């Protein structure tokens, strides 16, 4: 149908801004603390604390299959990575305030990215 067309050129294009979104996101952090799944084979125990991993990678998979249906499905994605490690890793670590950096630049980003998912519909 022309409807299934229009509601896939939609998608298209939430896909196209969420991944502007996801390179914003990506580049407050430049240490690639968060670039790629934790390994469990370097650490073994993780799914024992941590029920849904998350990182970037596994986030542009989802993207770029179109797996996002809208915005809040994208945060759900960043909040993992950031609420994960914020409970993995103590206080202290290079890990934890890298995430609390992550978090606080980033909220800016999807702050505006809100704005516009809304504007442009």
């Given at each position: 149908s022309?409807?299934?067309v229009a509601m896939e050129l939609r998608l298209t294009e939430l896909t196209r801004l969420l991944?502007?979104?996801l390179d914003q996101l990506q580049?407050?952090?430049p240490?690639?603390?968060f670039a790629q799944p934790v390994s469990l084979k370097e650490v073994p125990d993780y799914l024992d604390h941590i029920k849904h991993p998350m990182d970037f990678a596994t986030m542009r998979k989802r993207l770029e299959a179109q797996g996002y249906?809208?915005?809040?499905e994208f945060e759900e994605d960043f909040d993992l990575?950031?609420?994960n490690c914020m409970?993995?890793?103590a206080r202290d670590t290079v890990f934890y305030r890298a995430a609390v950096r992550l978090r606080d630049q980033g909220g800016v980003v999807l702050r505006q990215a809100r704005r516009e998912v809304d504007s442009i519909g």
């Open positions: 022309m409807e299934q991944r502007s979104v580049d407050k952090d240490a690639r603390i249906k809208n915005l809040h990575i950031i609420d409970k993995y890793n």
